[PDB]
């Protein structure tokens, strides 16, 4: 499956793509404002994610740091990124269908649209100004809006027991972005797409 990753932000981002125990494609790349990077994701990929990283530095070997979304200090991510990270999440070719969503469970850094480029389903978007409106207690000094699990490490926010409800913090994310997951047991906003669809992830889709 192809994923075209487009940076419409006015700032550079370092895109990342991983399934947690391996890179997807090259796993990461710089995207200056307006640039597009097309990756190939193996059919059947379960639990893949794409995200943006901000304010990165990398040496000539591909080692460094990012303020949001850092994946073990690598340009080429093989692991998931450090919160806060807006997440484009997907599982492909699962009993004949693909499943996509956007999640704020690991916080928010960059607005994104995640849409199919082929027929048969619809896209999802989280493009509100979550960083600007972020509750004071969730603001990440390094940039972004942390989720409450990251900040407070409670069973309730982290849904550790498999029992949890919505919270004031989850409701903030949900109010700004109804079409993204706000906590683990949120009413699902997953979209079912035809198996083997192709996609576009756009950072800063509206500005």
Author numbering: 1 to 207
Excerpt from the publication:
Among the sweet-tasting proteins, thaumatin is ~100,000 times sweeter than sucrose on a molar basis and about 1,600 times sweeter on a weight basis. Site-directed mutagenesis studies revealed that six lysine residues of Lys19, Lys49, Lys67, Lys106, Lys163, and Lys187, and three arginine residues of Arg76, Arg79, and Arg82 located on the cleft-containing side are responsible for sweetness, and two amino acids residues, Lys67 and Arg82, are particularly important for sweetness. In the present study, three mutant X-ray crystallographic structures of thaumatin (K78A, K106A, and K137A) were determined at resolutions of 1.07, 1.07 and 1.01 Å, respectively.
The threshold values of K78A and K137A were 220 and 230 nM, respectively, and sweetness decreased by ~5-fold when compared to recombinant and plant thaumatin. The B-factors of the main-chain and side-chain of mutated residue Ala78 were 19.64 and 28.49 Å2, respectively. These values were substantially lower than the normalized B-factor ratio of Lys78 of recombinant thaumatin (1.77 for main-chain and 2.20 for side-chain) in which the B-factors of main-chain and side-chain are 17.44 and 31.24 Å2, respectively. The normalized B-factor ratio was reduced 0.65 for side-chain, suggesting that the flexibility of the position of the mutated site of 78 seemed to decrease. Compared to recombinant thaumatin, the blue color of the mutated site of K78A dramatically changed and the volume of the side-chain was almost lost. These results suggested that the distributions and volume of positive charge from lysine residue were substantially reduced. In our interaction model, two flexible residues, i.e., Lys78 and Lys137 interacted with the sweet receptor within 5.0 Å.
